[PDB]
Each structure stands twice: as structure tokens, then as C-alpha cells.
Amino acid sequence: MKNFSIAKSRRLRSTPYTSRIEKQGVTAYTIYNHMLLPAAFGSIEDSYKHLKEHVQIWDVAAERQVEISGKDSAELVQLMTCRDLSKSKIGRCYYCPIIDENGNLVNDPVVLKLDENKWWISIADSDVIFFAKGLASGHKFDVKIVEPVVDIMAIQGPKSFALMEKVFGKKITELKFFGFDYFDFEGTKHLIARSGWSKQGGYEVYVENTQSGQKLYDHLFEVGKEFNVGPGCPNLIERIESALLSYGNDFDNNDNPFECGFDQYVSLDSDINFLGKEKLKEIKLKGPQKKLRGVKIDIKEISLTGSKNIYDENNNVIGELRSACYSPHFQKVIGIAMIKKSHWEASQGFKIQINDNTINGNVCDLPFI
């Protein structure tokens, strides 16, 4: 067979939105945090164009939360990330790389400060809950760690502001990027952040009152018709163009933050302790020997399923292509690659095999646009 079906089970968790999206045209799934995440609603290029011009509602429930509360909750959160949260404020979100004892990436979540003693870690695809539970036990921290009942719905695209203002009124229009607050829908208060896995604008509704969230979802589709609302999901083209990096795709637990472009989030000259701080000072002094870069490849199609080596003029491996797609903006394939220090330079040429032909590409900066 060309394509393979996904086998559903209790373990591959459905979401509060599954029944809805399966009547709205979902065509493909991925699995993310042991949960179904839509991957396509037909053509990825059509979804891309729609996202960039209108507004979409996304089931991103698979963006699970790790809730850490109690007296040592701030310290535990800080312990897991190289980002300095000492001046963090309630009602703000923070991109916080989580690192291990080697200094290598575990996850790249967004952390929400709900209170000094209550934190939500909105996670990429790894079981951060168990890292946090292991740490808390070993460090004898006084915390409560749970995966709360939170199922995010995202509202993304340029018309997201107009749609959300229609439903929630003027107060939501004051919400700054990476801020959050509480908004009423038909008597139920929902936490809403101005965030989401696109650079096309919008919000994430951290649904705790599930039935109210389901009714909100339906209401967004009803009153969003004038904005050409449609279903959607994180988009492969948009996210590669925007250089939104994906744990497990672009970087993994063999990579450190300096190989990923995360330099600005590694706080080494502060007084905070976090895992691997150690080794990260050593890495920063010598500098990385490999780093994420963009590539362009002159061909019009690709289906990347795993790393592909890229090569030099003496056919020595100089990198690994990790994410890629056809970009309508460039009218060629673009992608994200881990490249050796010899080949970092934007415009640097390389070779790659697709099917059985050697094809030229070149290195470029991130983001692409």
C-alpha cells in the first residue's frame, strides 16, 4: 500500500474535538504525546493559503499540559530549563527549552505562570511529566505534578483577531502576544493565551470545562462564516517557512540548545541553577560543531520520513536534512538541516539523493521569510 491507516485505540488518545473534525474533513493524523493530532485536511498547500488569508480552528489537544503546583513549583520549573524565569510574571508565557544532565534537549515547551506556586508547561512530543516526577522525587521537592484536563483549541490566521473580538469583545483585543487571561463564554471562564504554532496570529484556548469548550468550538464555526473560517492544523509549509522547530523532527535528545538556534534562551551568566548548566558553559565557549540551517533544493516535490544525509563535492556527509516541503513562495523545496560547521555559510552548496538522482541545494538562514 502507498499510505497506511492509523490504528486507533484507547492508548492513541482521542480528543474532545475528534468527532467534530472527523465530520469536517480530516484526512491524516499524526500522534503527538500519545494523542491524535490532525496532520491534514486534504491539500497541505490549500490549507497553507487559507491559514495565511483567513482563520482556522485547530484541535491541538495533543499539546498536553504538565501542571506543577506547590511550594517548590517555581524552583522545579526553573531547574528543568536554561531560560531565566527569575523575573517572570503571572499572565505571561515563556518559551523555555528543557534540558537534561548532558545539556541536551528534552522538550521545548511554553511555560505559563498562573501563580507563583502554579505553573503550566505546554509541551512538545515527549513525556515531560515523568522528567518532572523523577526530578521532584530525587530532589525531594514539595510539589504536586499532574497532567490536568486541558485540551487546547487554537484560532489562527489573520482573521483570528476579528473572530475572537466578535465572540469575546474588546477586552481580548488588548491581550499582548504571549500573554494570557480569563474570558467568559456563556458564563464559563476560559484561559486564553495569545499564542499558537504559527506566525499567522491568533490564540489558544486552554479548555478545562470540556463541554463549554466543545460548544465554543461549534460557535466559532457558526459565527466565523463571514471570515471564511475552516478547520485546520499545524501546517508543514508555514511552520518550515517560519522556522518553528519541532522536537523529534528538527532536534532531539542528542542535540543541545546551541546547535538549535536557542542561544538567546540559555541564561549562563545569571545566578539560577538548571540542569547541564555545567556542560552548556563548556559548549558555549568552544561553540557548536553543527547547527540547524535552512536549505533550498531545486526540485518541486519531496516526502520526508526521516533524516537524509547531505553531501559535499567530495561526497563526504556534511549534514542531515530533517524536515522539508515544497514551498509555493520559492517554487522549490525548502527544509531544515543539521549541518556541520564546514558548511554553515548561507549560499554554501551541497548535494543530496532523492529517489536515485543527485540534486543540488544550497544552505540559507532561518527563517525563510
Ligand X SMILES: C[SH](C)CCC(=O)O
Annotated binding site for (6S)-5,6,7,8-tetrahydrofolate: 122, 204, 206
> Which of 17, 29, 32, 206 is close enough to bind ligand X by CB under 6 A?
32
Burial 267-277, CB ≥16 within 10 A → b, else e? beeeebebbbb
Q: Is 1 in the site for a copy of itself (CB under 8 A)?
A: yes
Query: Cβ neighbours of residue 197 under 8 Å, at least 6 residues apart?
Result: 60, 63, 154, 234, 239, 244
Q: Which does 61 bind (CB under 5 to 8 A by kind): a copy of itself, ligand X, Na ion, none?
A: Na ion
User: Site mask, a copy of itself, residues 61-90, x = CB under 8 A?
Assistant: ------------------------------
Surface-to-core class of residue 174, CB atoms within 10 Å of its CB (0-12 exposed, 13-18 middle, 19+ buried)? exposed
Q: Which does 234 bind (CB under 5 to 8 A by kind): Na ion, a copy of itself, ligand X, none?
A: ligand X
User: Site mask, ligand X, residues 49-88, x = CB under 6 A?
Assistant: -----------x-xx-------------------------
Q: Is 234 in the site for ligand X (CB under 6 A)?
A: yes
Q: Is 197 in the site for ligand X (CB under 6 A)?
A: yes
Rounded alpha-carbon distances, angstroms, from residue 224 to 154, 155, 172, 213, 369: 14, 11, 16, 16, 29
Q: How does DSSP assign 133-190, residue by residue?
A: HHHHHHTT---EEE--S-EEEEEESTTHHHHHHHHH-GGGGGPPTTBEEEEEETTEEE
Euclidean distance between CA atoms 256 and 99, whole angstroms: 8
| Least CB distance to a copy of itself at residue 312 (A) | 22
Q: Which stretch binds a copy of itself (CB under 8 A): 54-62, 115-123, 244-252, 265-273?
A: 244-252
Binding residues: 122, 204, 206
> Which of 246, 267, 327, 348 is close enough to bind a copy of itself by CB under 8 A?
246
